[PDB]
Amino acid sequence: KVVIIGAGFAGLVAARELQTAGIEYEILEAKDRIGGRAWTEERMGRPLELGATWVHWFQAHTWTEIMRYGQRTEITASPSGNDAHWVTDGKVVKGTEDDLDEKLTAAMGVTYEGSEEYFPNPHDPLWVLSDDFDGPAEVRERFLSDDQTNAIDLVKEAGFDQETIDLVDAFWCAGYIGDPYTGSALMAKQWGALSDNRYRVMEDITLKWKLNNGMRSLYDGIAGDLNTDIRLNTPVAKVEHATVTTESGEVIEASAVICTVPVGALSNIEFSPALPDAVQSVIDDKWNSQGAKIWIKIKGHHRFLGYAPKPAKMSVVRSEYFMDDDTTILVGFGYDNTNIDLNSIEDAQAVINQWRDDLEVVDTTGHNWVADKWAGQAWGTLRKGQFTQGWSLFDDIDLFFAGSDYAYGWRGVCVDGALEKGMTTARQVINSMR
Ligand SMILES: Cc1cc2nc3c(=O)[nH]c(=O)nc-3n(C[C@H](O)[C@H](O)[C@H](O)COP(=O)(O)OP(=O)(O)OC[C@H]3O[C@@H](n4cnc5c(N)ncnc54)[C@H](O)[C@@H]3O)c2cc1C
Ligand SMILES: NCCc1ccc(O)cc1
Numbered sequence: 353k354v355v356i357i358g359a360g361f362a363g364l365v366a367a368r369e370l371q372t373a374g375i376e377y378e379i380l381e382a383k384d385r386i387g388g389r390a391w392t393e394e395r396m397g398r399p400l401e402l403g404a405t406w407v408h409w410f411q412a413h414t415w416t417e418i419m420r421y422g423q424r425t426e427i428t429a430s431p432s433g434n435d436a437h438w439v440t441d442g443k444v445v446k447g448t449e450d451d452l453d454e455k456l457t458a459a460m461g462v463t464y465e466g467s468e469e470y471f472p473n474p475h476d477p478l479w480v481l482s483d484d485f486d487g488p489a490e491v492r493e494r495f496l497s498d499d500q501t502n503a504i505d506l507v508k509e510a511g512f513d514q515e516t517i518d519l520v521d522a523f524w525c526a527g528y529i530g531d532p533y534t535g536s537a538l539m540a541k542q543w544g545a546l547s548d549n550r551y552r553v554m555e556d557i558t559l560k561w562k563l564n565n566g567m568r569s570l571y572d573g574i575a576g577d578l579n580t581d582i583r584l585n586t587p588v589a590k591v592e593h594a595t596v597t598t599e600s601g602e603v604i605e606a607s608a609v610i611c612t613v614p615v616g617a618l619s620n621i622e623f624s625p626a627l628p629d630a631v632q633s634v635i636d637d638k639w640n641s642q643g644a645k646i647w648i649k650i651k652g653h654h655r656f657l658g659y660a661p662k663p664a665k666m667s668v669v670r671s672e673y674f675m676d677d678d679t680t681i682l683v684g685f686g687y688d689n690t691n692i693d694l695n696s697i698e699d700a701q702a703v704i705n706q707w708r709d710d711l712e713v714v715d716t717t718g719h720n721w722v723a724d725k726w727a728g729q730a731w732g733t734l735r736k737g738q739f740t741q742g743w744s745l746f747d748d749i750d751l752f753f754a755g756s757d758y759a760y761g762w763r764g765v766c767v768d769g770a771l772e773k774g775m776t777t778a779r780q781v782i783n784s785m786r
Contacts, residue, residue: 354781355380355596355604357588357621358612360388361767362755362774364574365417366610369778371579375785378580380598382587382726386575388612389727390767392566395717396681398673400647402719403730404567404767405683406430408557410547411762413771414570418563421573426564431671434657437707439664440518444707449657452519453552459520460551462510463503463537464544470495471545475760477538478744495538499739502533503540522659525667526685527765529730530642532662538739539640546762558765562672567767587726588613590622593751608781612755612774615639616728623751630745639742639757639764640733642722644689648682648700649675649715656682658707665692666703679714689730694718732757732764752777 354370356363359381370377385391390404407427409415418424436452438445469491470480479485480495507520524532528539547554563569575582590597594606613621615638626632646666658669666684673681684703686692693699700716721727732755734742743763746753754777756762759769 353377353605353607354610355594355606355608356610356612357591357596358382358388358755359386359575359582359584360612360755361390361571361574361770362612362777363388363610364571364578364774365413365771366612366754366774366778367580368574368577369775370781371577373778373782375782376580378604379578379582380586380588380596380604381582381584384584386582386584387568387571388770389614389721389731390567390571391719392568396647396649396715397675397677398681399566400681400717401562401567403645403721405562406557406559407561407563407767410553410557411766411768413761413775414766414768417570417573417771421570423563423565423569426569427561428564429560430562431655431674434655434671436657436659438515438519438522438659439661439706440515445515452657452659453555455516455519456523457551459507459512459516460544460554462512463506463520463540464549465506466494466498467541467545467549470538471542474542474545477542477760478740481740496740498537498541499741500736501537502535502736503528503537504532506537518661519659521661522664522667525643525662525664525687528640528687528733529685530640530687530733532687534735535640536734536736536739539734542739542763543765557762570767588621590624591751592624593749607785609751610754610774610777610781611751612753612770614727614729614732614755614757616641616722617726620725628745628748630741631748634738634742634745637735639729639738640735641729641731641764642689643685643687643730644692644694644718644720644722645730646684646686646692646694646700646703646716646718648684648703648713649679650682650704650711650713651679652711653678654680654711656680656708656711660706662687663691664703664706665699666706669703669707689720689722694720731766734764752780754778
């Protein structure tokens with residue numbers, strides 16, 4: 353009688369884990385679909401990922417599901433060797449993708465400066481603050497200071513030129529899914545630590561390999577294993593911790609509640625008792641994910657890569673599919689969901705016009721996760737101070753919080769973190785039950 357709130361990857365894998373242990377469960381999902389912020393949907397002639405897209409075999413939890421559900425060889429690399437463009441002091445620079453990669457690689461070396469001392473085990477991100485920490489007190493001081501520094505200032509303080517600063521600004525507008533200047537640099541350093549402290553591996557893990565059959569092949573796979581029907585169109589309005597009340601007034605009694613609703617949507621639920629003050633502050637300030645993901649279709653087959661810094665409508669845009677009607681579908685990430693209408697052709701044209709006054713856009717699409725009352729955010733990213741006093745505070749309770757945003761590893765940004773934390777939270781419930 354464990355109630356799981358939400359049928360995203362975290363709730364689905366938690367349900368399967370409870371099923372293995374013979375523990376009764378039920379998933380309540382607000383929407384008329386499963387998958388959450390992973391959503392494979394036919395748009396503009398093709399199945400497109402409106403949320404989660406890229407995977408890698410160095411992501412333990414994602415890769416095990418890829419193997420489980422038959423997708424081992426069903427991955428394809430995104431287009432590479434694109435003609436690259438980047439905006440720096442208001443002007444467009446042209447170059448090779450290798451040119452751009454080399455600049456980012458140099459900047460990442462400084463950005464990841466401090467990961468080998470903080471993250472010898474990159475899956476123990478708070479080791480420096482633990483009582484097992486046996487390093488110099490100065491490392492702890494630097495760790496805490498880095499939570500209050502954004503990733504771009506690290507590159508500025510190292511003396512890189514404005515062209516590199518503008519590239520890194522663009523890069524982290526996309527990576528921090530919002531305003532990178534409010535972000536915690538420790539997020540970037542942990543990404544380095546999980547990627548052998550090498551830019552190319554980090555890009556290999558986060559932005560290279562796509563699922564031919566979509567994230568839906570994984571989340572429908574997990575759902576297909578479940579012996580208990582998921583209750584769609586059943587939003588939870590109250591959690592007593594247990595008792596769950598739906599929006600319709602149904603009261604469902606529970607032994608435990610696994611809540612996978614993300615921070616951007618937690619204010620839809622009334623908790624009794626109230627959540628700890630430190631958790632409420634995070635919800636009030638949420639996380640670093642105010643941006644948006646667009647899919648743009650242009651005439652012709654063009655191998656294109658574009659970078660632009662804040663406040664551009666989109667900061668990273670890249671060719672992804674070359675369609676059979678002589679069009680190209682490009683993906684884009686931007687820092688501010690309110691400065692772009694993902695479904696307006698003129699706004700998508702304005703994006704492409706950041707770099708090339710040609711390349712007319714014939715179609716565009718996307719889902720604005722931040723304006724979605726059941727998400728309220730894109731992928732979770734960290735504001736200043738939220739590495740050490742943010743994601744880890746949802747472990748207290750009494751009611752359990754699970755989701756990518758609380759993972760120890762590829763937190764927020766990857767399905768790997770949802771599969772990690774959904775599974776380990778189910779183990780917390782399993783361990784408590786006898
Ligand atoms: C634009 C974008 C691109 C991404 N790209 C990638 C990528 O390339 N690779 C990658 O690995 N990851 C990617 N991700 C991250 C990945 O999507 C997430 O890490 C993961 O899907 C989050 O899963 P979750 O189960 O923690 O949360 P969610 O998927 O948010 O699941 C929570 C569920 O709870 C439901 N819910 C909300 N409120 C209620 C309520 N009151 N009652 C009941 N149900 C409720 C929601 O509808 C949802 O189904 C991306 C995310 C975004 C936003
Ligand atoms: N949804 C996360 C996708 C992503 C990962 C890394 C990066 O630098 C930009 C985007």
